[PDB]
Amino acid sequence: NVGRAAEEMRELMGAKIRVVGDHVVVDGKNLAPTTLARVRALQALYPKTIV
Amino acid sequence: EEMRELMGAKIRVVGDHVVVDGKNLAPTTLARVRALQALYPKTIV
Numbered sequence A: 001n002v003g004r005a006a007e008e009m010r011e012l013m014g015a016k017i018r019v020v021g022d023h024v025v026v027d028g029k030n031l032a033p034t035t036l037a038r039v040r041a042l043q044a045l046y047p048k049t050i051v
Numbered sequence B: 001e002e003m004r005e006l007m008g009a010k011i012r013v014v015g016d017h018v019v020v021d022g023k024n025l026a027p028t029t030l031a032r033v034r035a036l037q038a039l040y041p042k043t044i045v
Helices: A002-013 A033-045 B002-007 B027-039
Strands: A017-019 A024-027 B011-013 B018-021
Touching: A002 A017, A002 A024, A002 A033, B002 B011, B002 B027
Parallel strands: none
Antiparallel strands: A017 A024, B011 B018
């Protein structure tokens, strides 16, 4: 279930925007390198991830 | 629980996998943290 996977991602970052769509989708305009590195650090939690 | 005792600046949460986070940790602390990486394959930092 991607619904629970999305919730886990949301808490770990709570400037990003989290939406469910069909796969996990993360978007943002001006994010710090640390935030991007943190975001792609969570990439090892679900293969179906796009940034 | 084993990870928590071995470090008791870090924050330990259960989530779904073991999650470790912190802002300004010493290199020794990071080296110690990834030294515990040989205890569970499902670890992220």
